[PDB]
Structures are given as structure tokens and as C-alpha cells.
Symmetry: C4
Subunit: 87 residues, 4 copies
């Protein structure tokens, strides 16, 4: 019931139900997310920006609210939104 | 004597005495906090905003001081305060 | 040669030599730091503000430079400086 | 294929291929990075500023983009850039 997402060493844990809410996104779509799955460690690994992920995960947890972390530059954050397919 | 609170993968450790200071809150009230207790991992798990929790825990540690993290948006933070019942 | 400081669940690792640089401080003075030592886990535990500690540790690592983290309020940070005896 | 960089207790994980992109830097040059390698723990250890490292790692991940974290002071960050040899 609980998924582990490893973003460059920073582990995030959430419920599969939280991700499946938006099946139109990378993390909400099994076919897409599975290419990042590590069966040895049983977690999804992304070699990407760590600070931006708090806002990405919150998008799912809040049911669709997206807020840019002030500490994260606008151009860095927009690239992440595009990668995770939230737009 | 020490409690572990797991907020979306981010572990916080504090003393039970620190939480019991405010028995009128979610974390200070055994009946409320226990529904989030995971006996397998022996920790309380919250699938919620990670950045906001530093200020939530500090509220207990400082004996009642609540300060909003600049890096956390006002509307996101207020929802957390309501959830943890600090108001 | 390496010490582990656990601040409310957030682990920091540094070298004993880095702390001993300022023997006039809490962390640089064996008699003071030892009352926070946990022999079971072999780490020093502080049930205190997590965000402020990055600047506290950097004080030792930089050889005396103290900068307040913008994300940490001035009154919260000053209380930490007083506790760790850096002034 | 995956490297672990331990910055004062904060673990970062990336791919060796991500670092080797810039062989002219500390982390991209085997001869330089190896003096910080810990064979016992199998990770590279740096007793340095933690907040600055997110932007340092992102430099490699983004293929050369360097942005200063607002929460990190300009003079602290510049010292890190010099140490990791990104300039």
C-alpha cells in the first residue's frame, strides 16, 4: 500500500492510492513509472532535483494543488513539472 | 521515551514528554495520534506536507511558539495547522 | 574520528577535530556535550530545531563563520546560538 | 553504476555517468574524488556545507546549469563552487 520514491538519495514514502489519483501523470501511470522501478531495492529512483520534489508529491497529496518552492528557481522547477507530466 | 514521526518518508524523533505538553492537540492526544500509529514499524505515519512539519514539531519543543516557514506557502501551512489541531 | 549528532531525527556527521576547534562551546567541550550522549545509539541527541543546525555545524566547519538561514526566523535562531554557546 | 556522496551526514545518490560528464571537476575526476572515498562505507565523505550541495549535484544532472540556493548565502556558496572546481 506504501510506495518509496528515491530522488537522488532523498526517500519519499506515500500511498499508492495517493499517486493513482492522477493516472494521467508519470507517477500515476504504471506503464511510465515502472521504467524507474528498481526491483532490487523495491523503490522508484530518479536522478533529479531534490528540492522540487516536495512540491511535486504535495500536488498528489493536496488533490491537485501546485505551488513553487521559493527556494527553487522558476526555470528549474518548470523543467520538473514537464518531466513528471503534471501540466 | 522517544517517539518517531514519519512524515512522507522524513523521520522526526522527539520525546513523548515533548508532545504530551499540549494534550489538546492531535499529537498530544493518545486517542487521536494512535490512529496513525504503525505497530509493524513502531512509528506514526502521516502522508502529508514535509516542509511544514519542522514548524509543527518546534511548536511543541518551544513550548507554544508557532512560526511559518518562509519556504512554505501561507495557504498550505494553514491547512497543516488545522490538521494537527494547534489552533 | 567521526561524530554523529542527531537533531530531532536529522543526523549530522562530522569529525571530532571539527568540533574540538572551539572548546569553549557546548559541542566543543566534552563535559558539556557528554550529557547529551546516547551510549546505546552512540550519538549525541538534541530535541531541538532542525533547520538552525546547518548554520551551527557550518560555524565549526568554516572556522568561525556564523550566518543565519533566511528560512529560519531571527528569534528562533538566536535561542539556538545561546543554547550551543557560540556567542 | 550508482555513487553515494555523504555530505556531513546527508546522503546523495547519483549515477557515475552523471559525474563523469564534467571530468574537469573534483567529483568528475577519479584522482581527485578518490581521496574522499571511504572503502569501509563505500561512499565519498565531505565534511562540508549541506544546503549548497543540492545546487552542486544539480549542476551535473542539468548538464551544466548552476543556480545559487536563495537559502544559502552568496559567500558561503562561492567557497563551495571553488572547492568542487566547477568554475
Amino acid at each position: 500500500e506504501r510506495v518509496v520514491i528515491n530522488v537522488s538519495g532523498l526517500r519519499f514514502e506515500t500511498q499508492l492510492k495517493t499517486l493513482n489519483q492522477f493516472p494521467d501523470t508519470l507517477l500515476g501511470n504504471p506503464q511510465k513509472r515502472n521504467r524507474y522501478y528498481d526491483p532490487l531495492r523495491n523503490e522508484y529512483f530518479f536522478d533529479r532535483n531534490r528540492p522540487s520534489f516536495d512540491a511535486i508529491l504535495y500536488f498528489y497529496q493536496s488533490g491537485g494543488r501546485l505551488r513553487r518552492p521559493v527556494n527553487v528557481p522558476l526555470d528549474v522547477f518548470s523543467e520538473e513539472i514537464k518531466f513528471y507530466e503534471l501540466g
